[PDB]
Enzyme design. Structure first.
Site, PDB file in Angstrom:
ATOM      1  N   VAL A 138     -37.225  25.518  39.209  1.00  0.00           N
ATOM      2  CA  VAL A 138     -39.302  24.866  38.709  1.00  0.00           C
ATOM      3  C   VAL A 138     -39.162  23.576  40.375  1.00  0.00           C
ATOM      4  O   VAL A 138     -38.161  22.795  40.384  1.00  0.00           O
ATOM      5  CB  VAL A 138     -39.258  24.191  37.586  1.00  0.00           C
ATOM      6  CG1 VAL A 138     -40.501  23.512  37.315  1.00  0.00           C
ATOM      7  CG2 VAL A 138     -38.939  25.231  36.537  1.00  0.00           C
ATOM      8  N   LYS A 198     -43.239  27.530  38.160  1.00  0.00           N
ATOM      9  CA  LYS A 198     -41.991  28.073  37.731  1.00  0.00           C
ATOM     10  C   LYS A 198     -41.426  29.001  38.737  1.00  0.00           C
ATOM     11  O   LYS A 198     -42.678  29.878  38.257  1.00  0.00           O
ATOM     12  CB  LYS A 198     -42.290  28.744  36.339  1.00  0.00           C
ATOM     13  CG  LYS A 198     -41.115  28.395  35.823  1.00  0.00           C
ATOM     14  CD  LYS A 198     -41.016  28.665  33.741  1.00  0.00           C
ATOM     15  CE  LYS A 198     -40.019  28.923  33.485  1.00  0.00           C
ATOM     16  NZ  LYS A 198     -39.923  29.111  31.793  1.00  0.00           N
ATOM     17  N   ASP A 248     -37.440  27.097  20.706  1.00  0.00           N
ATOM     18  CA  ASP A 248     -36.458  26.634  21.170  1.00  0.00           C
ATOM     19  C   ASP A 248     -36.640  24.689  21.938  1.00  0.00           C
ATOM     20  O   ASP A 248     -36.832  24.351  22.758  1.00  0.00           O
ATOM     21  CB  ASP A 248     -36.744  26.527  22.816  1.00  0.00           C
ATOM     22  CG  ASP A 248     -34.988  27.005  23.493  1.00  0.00           C
ATOM     23  OD1 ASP A 248     -34.262  26.160  22.811  1.00  0.00           O
ATOM     24  OD2 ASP A 248     -34.815  26.735  25.192  1.00  0.00           O
ATOM     25  N   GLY A 302     -35.845  21.413  38.381  1.00  0.00           N
ATOM     26  CA  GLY A 302     -34.963  21.747  37.576  1.00  0.00           C
ATOM     27  C   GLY A 302     -34.656  23.283  37.981  1.00  0.00           C
ATOM     28  O   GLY A 302     -35.506  24.041  38.544  1.00  0.00           O
TER      29      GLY A 302
HETATM   30  O1  LIG Z   1     -40.471  21.111  34.105  1.00  0.00           O
HETATM   31  C1  LIG Z   1     -41.426  20.578  34.596  1.00  0.00           C
HETATM   32  N1  LIG Z   1     -41.280  18.908  35.335  1.00  0.00           N
HETATM   33  C2  LIG Z   1     -42.204  18.268  35.168  1.00  0.00           C
HETATM   34  N2  LIG Z   1     -43.966  18.926  35.239  1.00  0.00           N
HETATM   35  C3  LIG Z   1     -43.354  19.927  34.752  1.00  0.00           C
HETATM   36  N3  LIG Z   1     -44.670  21.240  34.542  1.00  0.00           N
HETATM   37  N4  LIG Z   1     -43.886  22.067  33.449  1.00  0.00           N
HETATM   38  C4  LIG Z   1     -42.922  21.922  33.816  1.00  0.00           C
HETATM   39  C5  LIG Z   1     -42.748  23.112  32.613  1.00  0.00           C
HETATM   40  C6  LIG Z   1     -43.633  24.842  32.943  1.00  0.00           C
HETATM   41  C7  LIG Z   1     -42.744  25.358  31.678  1.00  0.00           C
HETATM   42  C8  LIG Z   1     -41.234  25.819  31.358  1.00  0.00           C
HETATM   43  C9  LIG Z   1     -40.415  24.419  32.104  1.00  0.00           C
HETATM   44  C10 LIG Z   1     -40.727  22.925  33.168  1.00  0.00           C
HETATM   45  C11 LIG Z   1     -42.243  20.901  34.073  1.00  0.00           C
END
Ligand SMILES: O=c1[nH]cnc2n[nH]c(-c3ccccc3)c12
EC number: 2.7.11.23
Length: 338
Positions: A33, A48, A147, A26
């Site tokens: 990420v 991240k 959020d 993402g």
């Molecule tokens: O966005 C994400 N996708 C899949 N696994 C993940 N684990 N942690 C995140 C994440 C953690 C903090 C903020 C945004 C995403 C993931």
């Protein structure tokens, strides 16, 4: 020194003889990420990567401090929160290494073609989320996520109901006022729309909205702007109480006080259902086979089950944040007895 704020990340590259970059999970305002294989720990991680920008670096330092605080607790309740494994600087970016999770509850709704998941799966998501909120309400944490939305709630495994909350980038502790606008518009509490003081109750409001969306497939309150958002809330819940609007700095953005001291909707420049006439009883289809009648002739969807669901949601969508149901008491609701 690079000119852009973003890190350049090449699929298949390997960081610090350890992280094998697979793919982009993402992008966001904060940075990106990525999915990576930690060859040392022999496991998938989500990395991240924070933009090299002062505001996002500040938000990410808050996220690191809150996630590390949560980690020191013994309770099993902490496993409803995504686990930060470690953080480091790489190529001049703050990088947060999290456990790898599956897809978010929005993706899950999209796989139903927005027809909604069952009441039984909704119940399981609701119980895990109330438990997560009870954990955040621990006095030594007192964390407001700020959020909550389907996109911030991830399945641990694509086959199972276990879930975790992610993204504490916008989060604060009780009594803080950091950011001018908070919460995602569809999930934004009345106290935030009204510019009144906010506490952990705004998260219970967001949870109320989310659970209705998970069962119906559609956002409860899909406002195009703050005025539209407040007007859609008012369609379902009526004019807020006088004791709130009399203390609300932004009451006159949405409402007007008539000569007798009673509040009405503000006149438009020159459309909504009348106040309180879009009943949650009919949105949920309590007596009429659930949303669009689609749950008649399935089990786990009785009138009795729907009344308990409706009653808990309307406690989460109390306009008064002092009387809105708290996680500790939501967990004892008959919706969870069975
Ligand atoms: O966005 C994400 N996708 C899949 N696994 C993940 N684990 N942690 C995140 C994440 C953690 C903090 C903020 C945004 C995403 C993931």
């Amino acid at each position: 020194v690079p000119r852009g704020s973003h890190m350049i990340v090449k699929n298949g590259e390997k960081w610090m003889d350890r992280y094998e970059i697979d793919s982009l999970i993402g992008k966001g305002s904060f940075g990106q990420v990525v999915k990576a294989y930690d060859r040392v720990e022999q496991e998938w991680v989500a990395i991240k990567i924070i933009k090299n920008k002062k505001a996002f670096l500040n938000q990410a330092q808050i996220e690191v401090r809150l996630l590390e605080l949560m980690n020191k607790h013994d309770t099993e309740m902490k496993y409803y929160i995504v686990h930060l494994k470690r953080h480091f600087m790489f190529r001049n970016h703050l990088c947060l290494v999290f456990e790898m999770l599956s897809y978010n509850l929005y993706d899950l709704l999209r796989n139903t073609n927005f027809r909604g998941v069952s009441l039984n799966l909704t119940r399981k998501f609701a119980q895990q989320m109330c438990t997560a909120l009870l954990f955040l309400a621990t006095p030594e944490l007192s964390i407001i996520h700020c959020d909550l939305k389907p996109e911030n709630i991830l399945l641990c495994n694509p086959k199972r109901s276990a879930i975790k909350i992610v993204d504490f980038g916008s989060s604060c502790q009780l009594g803080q006022r950091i950011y001018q606008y908070i919460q995602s518009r569809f999930y934004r509490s009345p106290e935030v729309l009204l510019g009144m003081p906010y506490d952990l109750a705004i998260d219970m409001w967001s949870l109320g909205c989310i659970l209705v969306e998970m069962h119906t497939g559609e956002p409860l309150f899909s406002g195009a702007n703050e005025v539209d958002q407040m007007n859609k809330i008012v369609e379902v819940l009526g004019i807020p109480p006088a004791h709130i609007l009399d203390q609300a700095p932004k009451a006159r953005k949405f409402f007007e006080k008539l000569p007798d001291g009673t509040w009405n909707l503000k006149k438009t420049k020159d459309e909504y259902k009348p106040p309180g006439t879009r009943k949650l009883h009919n949105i949920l289809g309590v007596e009429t086979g659930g949303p669009g009648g689609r749950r008649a002739g399935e089990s786990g969807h009785t009138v009795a089950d729907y009344l308990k669901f409706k009653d808990l949601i309307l406690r989460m969508l109390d306009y008064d944040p002092k009387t809105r149901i708290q996680p500790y008491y939501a967990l004892q609701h008959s919706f969870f007895a069975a």
